[model samples]
Target: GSMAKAAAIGIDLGTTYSCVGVFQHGKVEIIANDQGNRTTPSYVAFTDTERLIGDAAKNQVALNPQNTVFDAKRLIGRKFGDPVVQSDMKHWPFQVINDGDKPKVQVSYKGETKAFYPEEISSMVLTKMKEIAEAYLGYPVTNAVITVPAYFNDSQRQATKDAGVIAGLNVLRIINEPTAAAIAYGLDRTGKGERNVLIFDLGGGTFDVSILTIDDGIFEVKATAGDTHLGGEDFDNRLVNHFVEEFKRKHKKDISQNKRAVRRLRTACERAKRTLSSSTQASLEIDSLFEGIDFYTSITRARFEELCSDLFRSTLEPVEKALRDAKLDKAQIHDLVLVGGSTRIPKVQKLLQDFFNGRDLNKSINPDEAVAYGAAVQAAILIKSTRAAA
Candidate 1:
């Protein structure tokens, strides 16, 4: 509508979290939610009579694991028969039913069965981000450039665009995650010579690796590869399984036996994963976790690493594959730019460093917000192009 505000918002619709940004004062500024969080968890929860989004929804996962939907980013725009979708159902506590072979989450909030497509769940998250952006800018924001993984195929990209439309956004463009990160980095790196860089993006729901040639205001991708199905979510799932086994052995109860209990274990394991990143140990605390039994345990960082080593090992294959696809050796990669919130894990960083022969790793941008910042830059350019054409 003519009355709508022309806001240049860049949305990073990530798997585990989402971030919104605006090009304010000639620079990208991340917009925070009412909860003072720059990134909102991409979660949706349904009760008998109401629905919850973002952090509020995430907070309810332990109580309504099967009722609350998460990681829809992985399932969105995908067929139910896809390997990733099938694997996701095995780990996720939620009910994933097929609607004509399309993945849909079955939510029975008020004792009646209703299902929603992956795009609907994704759109809910996008709508929440739009609302936050509008409130922060004091305007009715209507346009956005949302970022997706480089490896997203036609169907997946279309699904993401559909989600934006459902969220009432114009859906300006669907950008690749690594390309977005390069834009964020290249904004201030102009007039510099060419540099061969690799973008290693490991997020909550997926893994993306890309090699780019940056020169003369141009960021060119030589090769890109990703697994839309893997990332920090798998890491958390593995940890949760470990906790489930421990609970089954010690408390004589299998926490994974039910949706509610499995959801609680996932919540606790997520906390331990975050803690292991910074502290030597973290306490997994879930009051009345299962059958009125308070589940409590301490996870040592070493033990956490040992349990997740296979997951860590699995991420490297993508990098090697991307490098081979790009036809470039590691020696030519001058900079290894780390992107994504999951890159905060020390083990991931160490693995990359070792693979690169201890080359200096770049950490100049906030992994969680970098993609959104880049999207903001792209949005600004899109707006400028539109005004010029008009």
Candidate 2:
């Protein structure tokens, strides 16, 4: 075993989650934090005496909604005065307040206080990621290839760079998330050719469909379209409403009548939603103020599809619109791959399969970690590392 460690890292600071991956042993491997988990929650929270991050910060959301800040991914690089950031952010639960001209998030510690721009809050998560890489590699993880949303413009991209600087990481390059997804997939498939590929990505916070032509060593993104405000979390809300109705029907009490019960039901809906992927029916549990209010109503995969049909419809509209933007259709797409954790829902997959018909839709890459792995591949490329240049 060698003592020296490779410090380079590929970081994906997603709107809903974040993960760090490193290139070592001739492969891109995700780095785990102290919690022994590969993916971190992409959240940072303020406390009276300290700050919390990742899994811990995510836990503080309901308990101390004032202090915990998640979803910095949306506000990163945008100011408080920006209309797009202001108008389009109504769907989320947390608040994004303002501090003078900069965007300030309202977080609670011992007290509610206005914080700096999301770039500053997100910097904490980024810095934490850097620490994870630095510790594992035994070297300072300064240089990095950071991935961002495909729709980011000049100011947004600059803000991403600013966050990287604030975190003290050398921002070597910025690659689009869907492109990174393609890179990791291409590498994993060991497929070679001048091929046209389509990526259907519904991440925690955004939905993007991209068409790319990959040949030899060049990967050119032909077209990309998506709504930054859409994603898995939105679908989660749809499920939460369904669960509320079912719970009310079963318990003779409307779950939504109680805020805490609604929260618990929402959490159950998310858990059951995950289970429905591998099982036809899953038992929905409610553990909150209503601990004993649990019931065993079967949420069939079929029912899951029915409840989320609108969600699928929402997704397809974007994909179809993207094809129009590219002037390309099913006939032009050689491949369609799903690339987000939310796509794991069997209903989503069923809808995708039907939409693509007979086209190859391989999803071997871990949906949650695929972007991070692809990110590492880009990091390898920007530095002209013959090993990472694959």
Q: Which candidate is the best by TM-score?
A: 2
lDDT tens per residue, model 1, 1-390: 454347679999988899999997788989999999999999999998888999999876776887999888889788899987887688888999978989899997676878999899999999999999999898788889999977689999999999999999998899988888878876337677887779998877678889888787677779988776678878898888788889888988776667777876887788788888889889988889878999878889888889888888777898889889988888988778889878888888899899989887776788889899899999988876433553
Q: How does each model score on lDDT?
A: 0.86, 0.77
- Clashes (backbone N, CA, C under 3 Å), per candidate, total 0, 3
The C-alpha stretches of model 2 lying farther than 4 A from their native spots are 1-5, 88-100, 106-114, 187-193, 287-294, 384-390
Question: Can you write out model 2's per-residue Cα lDDT over 1-390, one digit (the tens) per residue?
Answer: 846435578998887678899877679889898889888888887887768888888876787675677777767767777887777557556667666666777655555565568788778889988998887887677689889877788888888888999999889998888778887876335456767778888887678888877777577777888776677777778878786677667677765667777777677778888888888888875444354665556577787778768867778887888888777777777777778888787667777778888555768878888888988877866665334554
**Where is model 1 more than 4 Å wrong at Cα?**
1-6, 63-66, 80-87, 90-115, 187-189, 226-230, 237-266, 283-297, 385-390
Q: Which residue pairs show collisions in model 1?
A: none
**Could you tell me the C-alpha RMSD of candidate 2 in Å?**
3.6
